[PDB]
Symmetry: D3
Subunit: 138 residues, 6 copies
């Protein structure tokens, strides 16, 4: 799944896109996606001026956007719960995020997912995410 | 504590500043800070084009930056653990985030904190955050 | 009037939105709008890098956009044609709220005239008398 | 100039006369940040930003001779014509008085021959006493 | 132009000759995004972006007469002189052949009289067969 | 060579950084660098909004910045003076890695000449012959 199938699948547009390509896809349980970390991205100007590192909260969003792509390839998604999120290794410009998402429930008008992010072949982040589904509440 | 005492206290610079002012401060246990949500911020262009809402991961960063200000008014801080993070109400341009941070441990080369964010006087987010302290590991 | 109406009513989009919501509005006589000043806005990296002040000219645009909301919720690119008695007193910085008051004095003569006073919590910081012009499709 | 991008509005000063007169040229183009949202329908230079080109042409004089000069009074400002990418401003500022900790000037902005705007500006002279002043206001 | 900001490099086409020649003007200023980092020491228009002004002046011809024309060959390109804010490019493009699904042109860029750059460009003509082509490459 | 050396060695800072790291480097003969193409980069919102392609000219700059790393780890604003035999074949999109190979042919004659070939996974997508110039402090 190339980047521009991803664009209309994601409601997010720049500056808040964190998915570049999807390698694997199991229709409603599993997906893996790729995020290229390049020094030319906007967040690296201020985080940090001295040392460029991907913020941990943006890795969670990279987990969440990979979940939304799975969900909307599977027949507004707001992240509502973050549990057991662990951040292990610094993420540097030049790395590729291999973002893994496993589905745990799609039954509570929302979704519990459990995600694992890896650089070349070693884990750098994990989290258990839960979303909520709303559309123009008013 | 006005915005430009905050600037040198925070290692983050735009586009990744989420603290505008600190109202209260207890030297090493408690702080409250303010974040103004304005539609002219860069994240609202792509999140979302149809409906402007503050992402949940950026509220966690607003919690984390309020913790760093407490820590560096108290004699590189990387967020390493997110636990029990709950997101309750949508955050809209025009709202003020009253970010609360309570300190739980500063004893593990890092810090466990437990944060509560509120709009006018009602809770919209909470989280238990844990950081790690590194400086030019090489 | 919340921000999603503000954004559909204003012809200005980012990076030139200076109204976040309206709190009191009465049908072609008087309106009051709120602008949150945030340190994460795009103008503050340049004005100034040394000391972040809301530019005075952009307070005038905030006065202008507030009455465009008033002009247009009242039965087109409204462009500024004249400014008289523009007085600015106190620097407004990130962390402040601008309560923008606009009072109509004369409406369309192919252009409208308004008196506007901007305040921080209740101390006056800017006031001006604005006249706009209504437009072609040249 | 004390400012940088995104809020720099001068490129060249063609004629400099020690203490009372300059002519400056800021020149308009499509890649400036303001035209992305003002307007998406079609690009016009905002009238308030034309006032900056006047104020910045002023402040270049007052410290190329004889250094944050905040905008204090804008009287008799008329915006006769729209400014469009491809055009080139030709800002002339005549100093009228250096009365006290401020200065009154008369500015006229010109495109190739026609006159598109004029204003009468008055500023205020401080650098860093200004901080504690801004501290005392809060 | 198929592009928008931050990658628009034309403002006015002064002379248009149906199928073989234009002269265009992109004009340089300090508020363009490229000069924030090229260079922080002092601002020079990158030579590769001057090639865009040539290529965009070309592509305006080929569809103002007779619509994504990707850059395929850049031969004999010389950058004699630096381009600085305040300057104004004057891009001339002579069409030499519309051979097949592409076009060979000779461009010369001029500041007030002197010549700052020239190049010989060749493009490729597709719109949307280009997607599945890009799909087949992956 | 990781990114923090890349950023101190390159004179180009954002938004004009096009090298993320170097993987093999040998002292004034040959260098190989890596560029991650991400959909969250600033150029892709404008080139194109319809279809995100890495501009060909910025691949040349990536060739140029890679050899500036090579020129400067080998005992100043290196500016592009000539481009010959620039051939571009395949569109490179977000999700791809650019493996930038540069080979020195002649070093400082007040300028250097290099042959550069850029690749995606191993298929060649861009190649050029670059000559730069070393500079004044005009």
């Amino acid at each position: 799944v190339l980047f521009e199938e991803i664009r209309s699948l994601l409601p997010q547009k720049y500056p808040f896109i964190f998915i570049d390509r999807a390698i694997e896809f199991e229709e409603s349980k599993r997906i893996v996606c790729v995020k290229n970390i390049s020094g030319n991205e906007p967040v690296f100007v201020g985080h940090f001026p001295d040392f460029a590192i991907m913020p941990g909260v943006l890795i969670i969003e990279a987990m969440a956007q990979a979940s939304i792509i799975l969900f909307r390839k599977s027949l507004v998604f707001l992240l509502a719960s973050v549990n057991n999120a662990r951040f292990t290794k610094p993420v540097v410009p030049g790395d590729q995020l291999t973002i893994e998402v496993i589905v745990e429930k799609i039954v509570s008008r929302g979704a519990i997912v459990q995600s694992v992010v890896k650089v070349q072949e070693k884990v750098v982040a994990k989290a258990a995410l839960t979303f909520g589904i709303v559309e123009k509440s008013s």
